[PDB]
Design a protein around this ligand. Structure first.
Ligand SMILES: N[C@@H](CCC(=O)N[C@@H](CS)C(=O)NCC(=O)O)C(=O)O
Ligand SMILES: N[C@@H](CCC(=O)N[C@@H](CS)C(=O)NCC(=O)O)C(=O)O
Lengths: 252, 243
């Protein structure tokens, strides 16, 4: 038992930029100059279900942080953990009791109404057809309606007449939300059209993060539909296939 | 004074109720009857536009989400550190559980109430295929609870009871109350429940679980309220997101 499933010199982030929470953690680290050894784990190929990866995260999900012997999953937990270990600027995760509660409030609602809803178009347009499975139209339509309702709440409850989702500055909440919303955008769902306040929010977040950073975070997802069309994606392993079938059958 | 809007039929409502009672945080409890539809009434929507429970009102500061409310209260009233430890890694274990919980527990464990009580109340059956898929999903999630989170440790995020255990126990009680004996065959999980329940106290557990433990019989006796049209609408949407 040599622990050769090989460490980098420092902090390791196991990720795939096709994944929304992977992109959120990637961006946070890059923007703050947190030195991470990025380890690519190819979801479509099934490397997350490889013997090697399951030794690191038994759940076989991305992203995963490895800080020495300390292995941490869940983007929200990773983002917060990095923020306090690397003492990032307060605005991301405010200390103030109430401003922090607003971030935790968004992250909780996000997990219910954004996560698991906005990623469905990749399954419909790319990943299902990749393994010969079509998502029924009734479900696609239901998903479109749910996305619309969630965006409406995003504007009305969280953003309102304010600049960011949880107050006056960019927080972990804005990062999490943007990267989920990018998944359908990259597949040609024009989510920001007809929604000016959300559109301006997007520009505000991207302006803050920086074009070059956004560009390289989103590169892979912005190209995936065209790659699928030209049949250049990996063939899923049997383990990825199993997981894919389960995810597709979780679509309501 | 603090106000907590809740219904003890609701899992996250129960989690917050328990935390506050156990720590003696003085709350004005404000019952909002979910089955009736009071959560979609105009007066409650003036409090939480999302129309969901639980909701906390601290002066003119209105906060939703049980996880966020639990953390807020923990800091506000400076409760024993173990619930929400300050230590960087012990804290992350709590947040890690809460994130996974929101994916794999919340939305899966509540389904049997919809299958057995709430759907039938408004004339809608959940298809057998979905009930079986749900049973399989609960069993996979329980397995992860035991293998990844508990392991051979006493609680879900370490050596002491945290917010994670409270959230987990109250979701797991929903099917238990409806006759799913999900602790059968799972010694680590059964032991964990014993530990948590011993810490909270028998009386507090009984108060928190009384309503959900009597709901099946209320459905059988036909004594549940008639949902408002707004509640009916929300019910139909919830039922249709069952996969
Ligand atoms: N709530 C988790 C979600 C993690 C997650 O489900 N990640 C996906 C990629 S976006 C994954 O690894 N899926 C592979 C699988 O479930 O087999 C987080 O934000 O970290
Ligand atoms: N993630 C939220 C979930 C809140 C929630 O969905 N509560 C349910 C009752 S358990 C509710 O109010 N449902 C009514 C509806 O959605 O119309 C939390 O833990 O507070």
């Amino acid at each position: 038992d040599l622990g050769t499933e090989f460490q980098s010199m420092g902090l390791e982030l196991f990720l795939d930029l096709v994944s929304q929470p992977s992109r959120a953690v990637y961006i946070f680290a890059k923007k703050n100059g947190i030195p991470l050894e990025l380890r690519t784990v190819d979801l479509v190929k099934g490397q997350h279900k490889s013997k090697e990866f399951l030794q690191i995260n038994s759940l076989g999900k991305l992203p995963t942080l490895k800080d020495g012997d300390f292995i941490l999953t869940e983007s929200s937990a990773i983002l917060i953990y990095l923020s306090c270990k690397y003492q990032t600027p307060d605005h991301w995760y405010p200390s103030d009791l109430q401003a922090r509660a607003r971030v935790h409030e968004y992250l909780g609602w996000h997990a219910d109404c954004i996560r698991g809803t906005f990623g469905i178009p990749l399954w419909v347009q790319v990943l299902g057809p990749l393994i010969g499975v079509q998502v029924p139209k009734e479900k696609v339509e239901r998903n479109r309606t749910a996305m619309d309702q969630a965006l409406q709440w995003l504007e009305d409850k969280f953003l309102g007449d304010r600049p960011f989702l949880a107050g006056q500055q960019v927080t972990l909440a804005d990062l999490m939300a943007l990267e989920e919303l990018m998944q359908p955008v990259a597949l040609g769902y024009e989510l920001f059209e007809g929604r000016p306040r959300l559109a301006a929010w997007r520009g505000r977040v991207e302006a803050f993060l920086g074009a070059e950073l956004c560009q390289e975070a989103h590169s892979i997802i912005l190209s995936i539909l065209e790659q699928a069309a030209k049949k250049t994606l990996p063939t899923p392993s049997p383990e990825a296939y199993q997981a894919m079938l389960l995810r597709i059958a979780r679509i309501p």
